[PDB]
Amino acid sequence: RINTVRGPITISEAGFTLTHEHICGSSAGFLRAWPEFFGSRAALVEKAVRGLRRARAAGVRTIVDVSTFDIGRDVSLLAEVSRAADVHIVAATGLWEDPPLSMRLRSVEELTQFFLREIQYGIEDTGIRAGIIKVATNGKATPFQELVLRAAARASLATGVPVTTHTAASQRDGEQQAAIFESEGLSPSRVCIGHSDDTDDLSYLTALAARGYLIGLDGIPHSAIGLEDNASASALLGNRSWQTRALLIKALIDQGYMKQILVSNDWLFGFSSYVTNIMDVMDSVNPDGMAFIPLRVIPFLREKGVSQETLAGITVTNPARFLSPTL
Amino acid sequence: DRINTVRGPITISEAGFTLTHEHICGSSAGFLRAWPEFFGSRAALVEKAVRGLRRARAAGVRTIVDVSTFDIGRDVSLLAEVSRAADVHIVAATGLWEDPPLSMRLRSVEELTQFFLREIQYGIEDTGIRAGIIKVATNGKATPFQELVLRAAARASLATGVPVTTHTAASQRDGEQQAAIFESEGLSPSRVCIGHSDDTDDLSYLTALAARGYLIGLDGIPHSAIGLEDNASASALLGNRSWQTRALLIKALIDQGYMKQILVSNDWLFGFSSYVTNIMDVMDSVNPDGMAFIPLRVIPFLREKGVSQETLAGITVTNPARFLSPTL
Ligand SMILES: [Zn+2]
Ligand SMILES: [Zn+2]
Ligand SMILES: [Zn+2]
Ligand SMILES: [Zn+2]
């Protein structure tokens, strides 16, 4: 049984499940401290609930919100949005690209206790528990990032919740990640290598798939084609098309790794950890928001020969098996 | 001429004896809320800061300026709570210290100015507590962003009248480069305390500034790791100059004639998460007085070296209150 922000639910209550989404991409404390940045706090919470409603109209029953502490995971703001839309939300624990000083100077012993705090006891005074552990690298692991992986693996072994990881896929990051993970004795089935549609090296994915790992093609609408005037927007979203990412799903089923795909949008309704008005530009690319998966990518795949049977396994069965704890 | 503490405004005269650089907690933003167990509990941290705050009250302190910014983890409801309990005025801080996260770092100088003025004019968070001072920092040659932070902090101060205090690596003559940016923005040296300057011995560097009109913050008087050379992490934080060696810098800056531009404080704290673990264990036994070290051990030291009580009173009451009075 899975922990959501509104309590525990059973495996089959989950349904069609986006497995890497954000409500707001921010920093810790930024939302409390400068909420005019997003218009107002209520201005943003409306923007999420409009956008979540649109996906729940499209069949989505659960999102996994992989914002960690250093992304500003306002776990109350989540459960606010989760009532008003009737979408389960699974919150995350862990650490992203930007930990603060009070994190960086901790030992792998200390980080393991904090990770188990938010899985076993609760995120802040709020009593909500996290069902997934997010971690991150961009290239070679820094010594701290190395600690984070081992602490998240030692956490994932006392609790059974899985690990999802941020990756710069162009530099075969999952390889080092999985090397570090397996050194701690974590089953490759308890780990999704994320941001993996950012590469075109299929051999790297299928090699990683074949050791047992789950592959996050969680970036399907991230494309800055049409924004070759925005320098920063092109940097954040890559020059590969959405169909280019989407086809890598079919290509990975073809190698007989349907059992191992998770698909998601990596969308967000507030974005402060990048240049200003980046959210202005991203919403014009993709008005559908988080609804881009059931409205545009599921039709596109049925148009390329993927039946409703295996689509339903990827969107319902795979996240169900992946989020259920396992000792 | 009123100043904003965390329990509403007060008048200049109400300030009294004032430590112009202190911390209740040295942390990062929401670290306290997220992992209170690192400090024992949120209760346990509040007990310990009130205890130390009453010890300094009984030695005669009324007002401390807690200069923790957003990224030192400035919990103003926490600060308001220990101000109620220990009957001590606490001025709160806006600005950006050594560790700004992504959502500040990507901001322009215009935006950062909108943010400082928000914490000065409107309030901090949803609490409606207003800041009385803008803290910024460099170590060495300013990063381009540190130039953006100094310039926006300077634009707020001209727009509001609140002073700017700073953190420096004194040994590298930072106050030279801070001052050049400040004065390039139209800001009066009277509005800027160049701090952490008892971490140098280059006396002519302090005097060169102080003549240009700046205030000089001697804000780490019991920082010294003497007798703690085997602890390499502690020796890095506190340095190897004893506390007498710093306390002399006061008397030596009085003498040069600059009694009016001298602010004195501890840079103490009751919870420290943004350094190695158990560093708070070490610091509390170097100095059991805590924030009381300036009334209890540095004041009697200076009178034995022959400073006039009328000069001491101006240093701790006339000097802070002139700094914190808003001036457009
Ligand atoms: Zn990511
Ligand atoms: Zn993400
Ligand atoms: Zn400092
Ligand atoms: Zn300080």
Residue numbers in the entry:
A (entry chain B): 36 to 362
B (entry chain A): 35 to 362
What does the paper say about this structure?
Crystals of C23_1 obtained from 10% PEG 6000, 15% MPD, 2% PEG 400, 0.1 M HEPES pH 7.5 diffracted to 3.2 Å resolution. Since the crystals diffracted so poorly, it was deemed to be unsuitable for use in OP co-crystallization experiments. C23_1 crystallized in space group P212121, with two dimers in the asymmetric unit. To avoid forming inactive PTE molecules containing less than two Zn2+ ions in the active site, it was crucial to add ZnCl2 during protein expression, purification and crystallization. A53_1 is presumably an inactive monomer with one Zn2+ ion in its active site and C23_1 diffracted to low resolution.
The enzyme phospho­triesterase (PTE) is capable of hydrolyzing such OP compounds. Accordingly, it has been characterized from a number of bacterial sources, including Brevundimonas diminuta (Bd; formerly Pseudomonas diminuta), Flavobacterium spp. and Agrobacterium radiobacter. The present study focuses on Bd_PTE, a dimeric metallohydrolase that has a (β/α)8 TIM-barrel fold with two Zn2+ ions embedded in the active site. Carbon dioxide reacts with the side chain of Lys169 to form a carbamate functional group within the active site, which serves as a bridging ligand to the α-Zn2+ and β-Zn2+ ions, both of which are required for full catalytic activity. The buried α-Zn2+ ion is ligated to the protein via direct interactions with His55, His57 and Asp301, and the exposed β-Zn2+ ion interacts with His201 and His230.
